[PDB]
Design a protein around this nucleic acid. Structure first.
Lengths: 68, 78, 97, 49, 49, 321, 368, 64
RNA sequence: GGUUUCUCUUCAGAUCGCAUAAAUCUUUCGCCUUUUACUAAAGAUUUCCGUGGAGAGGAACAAUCUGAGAUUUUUUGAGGCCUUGCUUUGGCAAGGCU
């Protein structure tokens, strides 16, 4: 709820790092969330070396943890 | 919200990575309300092998990550 | 199933090509035209008696100053709130042009 | 005019008289008839968004 | 006739349906009959052209 | 005053004046001056303060048909004490309801026009009269003005084909086409779509009903229908949106008639105007004069139109001050 | 088709080029607008209707030019046609007096001009396909069906060139060598027009003889075309020509009580009601009628005036008919301002158009 | 529930959740992505008509 | 997070007014001995009868009122395990397992 809105505000104001369940940590500006925990992030570098991507949409089933 | 952006970006060529390590890059033709999508001219890279050209590839929710194109403004769908 | 002499049976809840009873309207009349008639009749005739009940049945909420408008801009506002943005014309030009 | 008012938020039709966005010539305003065809480039959503 | 002869896709919208309701006060079955008559006339004109 | 209440009150006045002149055997004018030049002015307290006044004109209303205006129709300030109708005792803004608006529209029937659109005023409106003044040419129904401004081979008689003469009306309707030197000319409004509105007489008929004045449709090659009962039965608790709502009420035809009412009667709310600023008879001379009238009243119609056009032409927006 | 013709003049002649610049400006701003300069020096604007030309003239007077401008009365542009065949087998010859062209002109059938103008048949078709198209529905001979050379004043124009030469088929290679120059002579002759400098329509030009000089070269290198123009004009003049007047199709939407009043307006303007019908689902009526285009000036204004603005009409170009008079009757006297009756109409239109642009006298044997 | 219309009659190559790859002509599919395909040739074996569940099909590609 | 009413200040570019008067000046007319008072058109300005928005102060009434606010296919367990190179010691890349 409001904690997800605060996390989206932190990801708009800074870079949020999310570690998925597929052993990949992606750091970048997360733009949108979802009710099924799907995350849409802009300019995200995912390390699993860090590879850069412009826009990445990930389903919430493969997500594990996230932080600012 | 994210499904709305995925349906809105269903014209340009995008790259979708499955949970099995298969990555397919091609032009999205139709994306449903679920994660099932259809792609054309897909230069699908095999799992630690060479890529192949597929005319029409249909993917349940087996896709883990999808690389959306750069056509995404701050208020295109927000 | 809407347009073109298809009738609706609420007992079987099914759309048939044959009218089930006499004086039974078609699906386009009963499902599309008659609620439009009832919406415009409730606006232009019953703006103060049964209009907020009718707007509550449609899930449309209006402010106090919006109900003080004259009949043509209020009806325009009610139809804009009900039908929303213009999407059928856009879908026509997508799947037919 | 309806498509413009759907797209443009601060452009609103007046209550008494009809707005006419594409009729930009004053001859079309005084005559009340379309004279010259006008193009409009707009971005519109469908039912699927 | 000109749109058929220019080889373009043709779609039809029926504007001013409120004139069937507020202005003419038709019953809704007769409004359906008028709309179907309009559609049949346009289809007959296209099939003739 | 509220403008529809004022117009309805004067329409009721018009009805009782016509009835009184029809029914009285000998109407007698009061003499002028009522008092002599040496008769002193009467004291109010000695003569007028302690006598009961006589009756007013006051058209009696039907308690059934004219119910929602029956209580307050003949007050000085009609609904000033009420709060849900007027804004207060400064009596500035008014909000009314549609049944009593239809009652006022019925009561003001004698002083109102029968037209539903401006297509009656084709070459008989303000822009046409401005063009007519600027060209120094006039329709015989319209007014006349002073001139504003005061060899050609196009006027050669051996090069001009005449089948129909170029009249005044074509020089007004298309003024840049048929006039050399057009100056200070206003383009008239073109055709407006015809308001095909059917007036119902009896309230026993339904509000949505095929009138005999409308021509029948008489509808007389396959449709892309789906398969009959193959699939797609409707789920439970789905319905048309307003199934419990009736199609039409008793106020529906009155509201539909109020949609195409004249200018003060197609409103739910408005601002009160001064009693000087309401011309009750402007629509009478803004239309054409009826046939069979004598010369004197047609000249009166022309002069009223001339004064109206001269008021509209010289009008400027007011300054700040 | 833009058929309404309006002459335009500046008030001060010293401001003559300025409005000319504005004329170029209105030619930039209207697609179907045609501006011509005649031999008389006047400038001619062609339009489709009264409202269209009113908008053009308002834009000329207020936007692209500040010059006060005189406007003439509106007229139409006519065409030229024939009724009966060439009674005399007329002919002409080259300035190098070896080639001799003999050709006669006769009118076409009913559907042929509208079949050519709607591009049902083209010159890019197969010769056998074109011959089958003529033979199945026009019952032409196959010799005549293979005889068709060229069309009209332009591509898909409503005139047909047919070559039927039996003694000149022995040098038909040389006939095909001069065929192209015969074609441009035919195009120029049907584009210009000898009667009142208007277009020629619904004529079949049938060649009878072609005495071509053997290997002409020096004489067959440009002298063929004005010879062919004189042949076309002389064959046209010997076949009782007529003026060919445009007609408008008018649809009127009216209330039921005003309909007969609409008839009255057509009674003053040489019109006739094609079809009166009630509109289904509406309390109005549709009156479809045909009017002459000359009598159509201010028809809408008179219709709205006589019906208190209730009846409204729209009008568009439909087709052409023949003027009831004869254009070449010298015995017809023309009153200078009286509206002429029906047998004097073509003579009046002829005389006034020729006084408008060209020479007053017309000679039937002016070429040969 | 929408991909069955475009591949109603054409043969397709299917990839199951066990890593198996098959080729066969699909006939009909259910609303829960349970697709029935005839002549499903295993890649080397032949199985004929077989129905696959929605969670079984990891990916699909159009063969015919 | 009240209404009504009174007064003052400021801004009006909306048909500020779904109504419409008068005056001054400069010219053209008409009447015409001359001057007011006049005729009726244009242009440039003003006055008057009214109006809208915002702010401030006062008085009388309700004293609140009006708001915003889990397993059964595709969003949760098919989860663990040995070997090869790196070990970047949290594991990655490859095989049969269950």
């Amino acid at each position: 709820g409001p904690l997800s809105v605060l996390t989206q505000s932190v990801k708009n104001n800074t870079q949020v790092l999310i570690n998925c369940r597929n052993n990949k940590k992606l750091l970048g500006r997360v733009k949108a969330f979802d009710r099924h925990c799907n995350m849409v992030l802009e300019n995200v570098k995912e390390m699993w070396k860090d590879r850069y991507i412009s826009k990445m949409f990930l389903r919430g089933d493969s997500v594990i943890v996230v932080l600012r | 919200k994210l499904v709305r952006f995925l349906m809105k970006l269903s014209h340009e060529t995008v790259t979708i990575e499955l949970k099995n390590g298969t990555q397919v890059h091609g032009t999205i033709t139709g994306v449903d309300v679920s994660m099932n999508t259809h792609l054309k001219a897909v230069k699908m890279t095999l799992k630690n092998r060479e890529p192949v050209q597929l005319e029409t590839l249909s993917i349940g929710n087996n896709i883990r990550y999808f690389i959306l194109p750069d056509s995404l403004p701050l208020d295109t769908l927000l | 199933r809407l347009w073109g002499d298809i009738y609706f049976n609420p007992k079987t809840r099914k759309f048939t090509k044959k009218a089930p009873t006499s004086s039974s309207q078609r699906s386009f009349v009963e499902f599309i035209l008659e609620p439009l008639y009832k919406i415009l009749a409730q606006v232009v005739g019953d703006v103060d008696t049964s209009l907020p009940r009718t707007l509550d049945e449609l899930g449309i909420h209006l402010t106090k100053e919006e109900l003080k408008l004259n009949i043509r801009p209020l009806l325009r506002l009610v139809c804009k709130k009900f039908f929303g943005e213009f999407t059928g014309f856009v879908d026509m030009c997508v799947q037919h042009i | 005019d309806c498509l413009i008012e759907q797209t443009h938020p601060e452009i609103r039709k007046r209550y008494d008289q009809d707005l006419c966005y594409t009729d930009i010539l004053f001859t079309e305003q005084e005559r009340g008839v379309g004279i010259k065809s006008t193009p409009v480039t707009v971005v519109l959503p469908d039912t699927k968004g | 006739k000109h749109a058929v002869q220019e080889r373009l896709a043709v779609t039809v919208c029926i504007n001013k349906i409120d004139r069937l309701i507020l202005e003419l006060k038709l019953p809704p079955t007769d409004a359906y009959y008028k709309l179907r008559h309009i559609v049949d006339e346009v289809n007959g004109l296209i099939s003739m052209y | 005053v509220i403008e529809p209440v004022y117009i309805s009150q004067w329409g009721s006045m018009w009805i009782m004046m016509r009835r009184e002149k029809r029914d009285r055997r000998h109407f007698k004018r009061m003499r002028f001056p009522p008092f002599d030049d040496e008769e002193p002015p009467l004291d109010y307290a000695d003569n007028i303060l302690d006598v009961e006044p006589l009756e007013a004109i006051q058209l009696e209303l039907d308690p059934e048909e004219d119910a929602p205006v029956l209580d307050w129709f003949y007050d000085h300030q009609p609904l000033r004490d009420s709060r849900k109708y007027v804004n207060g005792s400064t009596y500035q803004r008014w909000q009314f309801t549609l049944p009593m608006m239809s009652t006022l529209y019925r009561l003001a029937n004698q002083l109102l026009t029968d037209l539903v659109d401006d297509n009656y005023f084709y070459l008989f409106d303000l822009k046409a009269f401005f063009t007519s003044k600027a060209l120094n040419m006039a329709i015989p129904g319209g007014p006349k003005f002073e001139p504003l401004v005061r060899w050609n081979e196009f006027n050669d008689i051996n090069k001009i084909i005449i089948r129909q003469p170029i009249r005044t009306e074509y020089k007004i309707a298309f003024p840049y086409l048929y006039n050399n030197l057009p100056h200070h000319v206003h383009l008239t409004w073109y055709h407006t779509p015809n308001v095909v509105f059917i007036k119902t007489e009896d309230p026993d008929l339904p509000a949505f009903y095929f009138d005999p004045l409308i021509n029948p449709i008489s509808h007389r090659s396959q449709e892309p229908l789906p398969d009959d009962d193959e699939e797609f039965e409707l789920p439970e608790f789905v319905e048309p949106f307003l199934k419990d709502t009736p199609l039409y009420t008793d106020n529906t035809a009155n509201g539909i008639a109020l949609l195409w009412a004249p200018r003060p009667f197609n409103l739910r709310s408005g601002r009160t105007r001064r009693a000087l600023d309401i011309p009750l008879v402007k629509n009478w001379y803004r239309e054409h004069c009826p046939a069979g009238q004598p010369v004197k009243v047609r000249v009166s119609y022309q002069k009223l139109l001339k004064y109206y056009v001269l008021n509209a032409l010289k009008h400027r927006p007011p300054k700040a001050q | 088709t833009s058929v309404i013709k309006i002459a335009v003049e500046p008030v001060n002649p010293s401001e003559l080029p300025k409005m000319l610049d504005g004329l170029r400006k209105v030619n930039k701003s209207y697609p179907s607008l045609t501006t011509k300069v005649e031999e008389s020096g006047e400038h001619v604007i062609l339009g489709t209707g009264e409202l269209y030309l009113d908008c053009v003239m308002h834009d000329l007077r207020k936007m692209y030019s500040e010059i006060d401008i005189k406007v003439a009365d509106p007229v139409v542009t006519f065409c030229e046609t024939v009724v009966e065949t060439s009674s005399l087998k007329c002919f002409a010859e080259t300035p190098n007096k070896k080639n001799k062209i003999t050709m006669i002109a006769e009118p076409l059938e009913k559907g042929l001009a509208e079949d050519i103008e709607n591009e049902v048949v083209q010159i890019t078709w197969n010769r056998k396909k074109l011959g089958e198209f003529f033979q199945t529905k026009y019952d032409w001979d196959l010799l005549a069906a293979r005889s068709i050379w060229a069309f009209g004043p332009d591509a898909t124009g409503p005139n047909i060139l047919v070559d039927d030469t039996l003694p000149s088929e022995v040098d038909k290679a040389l006939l095909g060598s001069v065929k192209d120059s015969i074609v441009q002579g035919f195009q120029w002759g049907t584009r210009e027009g000898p009667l009142c400098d208007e277009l020629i329509r619904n004529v079949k030009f049938k060649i009878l003889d072609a005495v071509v000089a053997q290997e002409p070269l020096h004489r067959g290198g440009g002298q063929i075309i004005p010879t062919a123009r004189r042949v076309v004009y002389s064959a046209f003049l010997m076949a009782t020509p007529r003026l060919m007047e445009p007609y408008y199709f008018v649809e009127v939407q009216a209330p039921a009580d005003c309909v007969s009043a609409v008839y009255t307006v057509l009674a003053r303007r040489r019109g006739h009601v094609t079809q009166d019908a009630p509109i289904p689902g509406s309390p109005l009526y549709t009156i479809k009628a045909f009017i002459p285009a000359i009598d159509s000036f201010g028809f809408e204004t008179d219709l709205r005036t006589h019906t208190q603005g209730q009846a409204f009409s729209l009008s568009v170009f439909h087709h052409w008919q023949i003027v009831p008079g004869d254009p070449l009757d010298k015995s017809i006297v023309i009153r200078p301002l009286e509206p002429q009756p029906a047998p004097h109409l073509a003579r009046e239109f002829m005389i006034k158009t020729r006084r408008r642009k060209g020479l007053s006298e017309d000679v039937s044997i002016s070429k040969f | 529930s929408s991909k069955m219309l475009q591949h109603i009659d054409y043969r397709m190559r299917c990839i199951l959740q066990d890593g198996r790859i098959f080729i066969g002509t699909f006939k009909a599919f259910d609303k829960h992505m349970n697709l029935i395909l005839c002549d499903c040739d295993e890649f080397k074996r032949v199985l004929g008509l077989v129905l696959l569940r929605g969670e079984n099909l990891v990916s699909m590609t159009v063969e015919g």
